[PDB]
Symmetry: C4
Subunit: 219 residues, 4 copies
């Protein structure tokens, strides 16, 4: 009756992609999420999706903490929820990407987590944990491992300036990034540098992807 994530939902007999209620160990009130029941067997809990630029992603700290957008469309689940999910078990991360030319690619990471051992994940900046890459999109996230999450109004990166403001996004910026999936929906090639929905290892630093979806599943 109380699935902890989309894998529990799947194993309980629910095979259709869609919105379901999940109840993380330390977030007993629970919340709704979009479940991908098809990718590599299914059971993936989505936490980010870009697909048409209908939602503004250049948001501040509170928004990235609490989440925004809609589960059936573009959205960000919220770092407080992502933390609740990834700390209750060992999760893997799957990232699906799509360009404006019919092309698709993906990146899988054997281990993924946010603020895994932080006493206060929010004050600690929801530090990223990620490793073990494999896929077709190439790795554009391993360099971000260990970095705190930075937004336009809360700098915690390794740059002299605010990477989030400079690259119009919100991410576990270093100095500054190799991936920027929460960047501006610029739609394809653009002159501005690395400030769109980027995944450098696949499409470079001046090409804003058409679609992106970040999801997790217990290892």
């Amino acid at each position: 009756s109380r699935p902890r994530d989309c894998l529990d939902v799947l194993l309980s007999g629910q095979q259709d992609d869609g919105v379901y209620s999940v109840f993380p160990t330390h977030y007993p009130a629970g919340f709704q999420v979009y479940c991908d029941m098809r990718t590599d067997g299914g059971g993936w809990t989505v936490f980010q999706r870009r697909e048409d630029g209908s939602v503004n992603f250049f948001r501040g700290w509170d928004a990235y903490r609490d989440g925004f957008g809609r589960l059936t469309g573009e959205h960000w689940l919220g770092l407080k929820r992502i933390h609740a999910l990834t700390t209750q078990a060992a999760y893997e991360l799957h990232v699906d990407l799509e360009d404006f030319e019919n092309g698709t690619a993906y990146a899988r990471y054997g281990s993924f987590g946010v603020g895994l051992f932080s006493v206060d994940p929010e004050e600690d900046g929801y530090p990223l944990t990620v490793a073990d890459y494999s896929g077709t999109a190439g790795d554009s996230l391993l360099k971000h491992s260990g970095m705190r999450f930075t937004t336009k109004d809360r700098d915690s990166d390794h740059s002299e300036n605010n990477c989030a403001a400079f690259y119009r996004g919100a991410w576990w910026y270093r100095n500054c990034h190799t991936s920027n999936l929460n960047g501006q929906y610029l739609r394809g090639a653009h002159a501005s540098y690395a400030d769109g929905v980027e995944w450098s290892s696949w499409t470079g630093w001046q090409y804003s992807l058409k679609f992106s979806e970040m999801k997790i599943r217990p290892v």
Copy 2:
């Protein structure tokens, strides 16, 4: 022991109209509500009631989010509670109205919801979901489908100005409305335009109703 709404309360053997405790899926602490155990079989959870103008409804955003008034009289349950209720299952909406001339009418909607797929229903403005009308009061709500909730201190309507301020209420304003049940208790016909407890399809834009009650029941 833990009814999720008034229908569960009814099915458990409670047949008297009154105040009962309910526990929505994602609001485990629960809260009290007024249950209508008579209308069309009973089991309706009330979330709004106007009946004598004793309570001020020209309130701000926090009040409409958290609720105000008293369960045994005029009140607004609060968008956070209405959201908790309508997202846990598919609900229908029933609206009972009464004028100052002994007359009554009602409007039933096969589907009703608030912020159904919003990651953060409050930030998303508790968007309205409603469809499938039937009744005697006529439909004065379908045009509001998809609109966010707007209050005098938080504009999210499709008007150049603030509909909530202009029509002294709080509603899922468009530009501006066909219904305004949270408007001023003006008592019958009035010169001011559409700023009373209106249900245009039944009594027009210049007649403030004597009674209104909005309630929901699982489809």
Copy 3:
């Protein structure tokens, strides 16, 4: 394992007065309270106690809402907790008083409640519900029935001024009071008017009591 109040604690086999954990229906996290297991059979949950003036009771709204002092001594449980307790069942109120001359008296009320039907008890001012007096101290509370709770920084009384500020306390002031148990610990007779720990029906308006304890038990 989860007593809802001190009566449940008593009925479970706990006969010693003391501090115990209770879990109100709509406050599942629970909290600790002092239980009186001797008065008229025992099972009373204490919510207020004055006994030596060691604690300041001239506090603001947040303090009276959340509570202050210590369970083993002078304290105020907090209106949010008192509300959680009195709305889960029908409770009676018992008030024990003591003067500085060895004398004692008590007042019992067959029904007692705070914000019983308020959608938002805090915004509604935790309105008092009380009736059916009997005892030796005389009735000094029935006149306060229906009044909202007023503090020095939140006026909701029927006076032109702030009763709480004027009589240095916090109570369900009318205009202004017949009882003021949260008043200043003035110790016996005093020149200032009605601004001490008063229970007018027993000791008048210019005598601050030595001891007072307010507690509840399911009817």
Copy 4:
């Protein structure tokens, strides 16, 4: 399935030191903590650790209330959590210390608690309860019994000034202290007076320890 502390975790079959989920009686959502499963039989819940000066401990009131640092390294669990743990049962405290010269020592207290009978532990300043010393480090905490917790931005000590600011730490200061484990990581002997990680009874007032760990276990 719901251990209340690390002793429950141990008794359930978990013998490895590490991070585990615990669920205090009045903090049902639960949280993670580091468990010491080796010291004197194991089952100790850690709430403070200093080991390399990588974390800033000169923090304000909110930080000491909510916690900071990481469970696998230097951290402070947070007074709200320590309170939730120590009020659910009778706990003993164990303090392990280490200097920069290979030396180690410890202090054990038969009884330990924070804000044990406070209606609102935070407003009451999380008062310290501690007694019954035994060990090799000597007692440097008994004098602090009964004192409230003081930080650089919230003075509640018995000093004319702010002990926390003066001795660059956060503690249950009196006037001012005999122990200062949350002080500056000064690394050994230092000229400044008593403003490092001190445990006076063992190493004096001008020697900042290399390691310290504070943990609790049910008596």
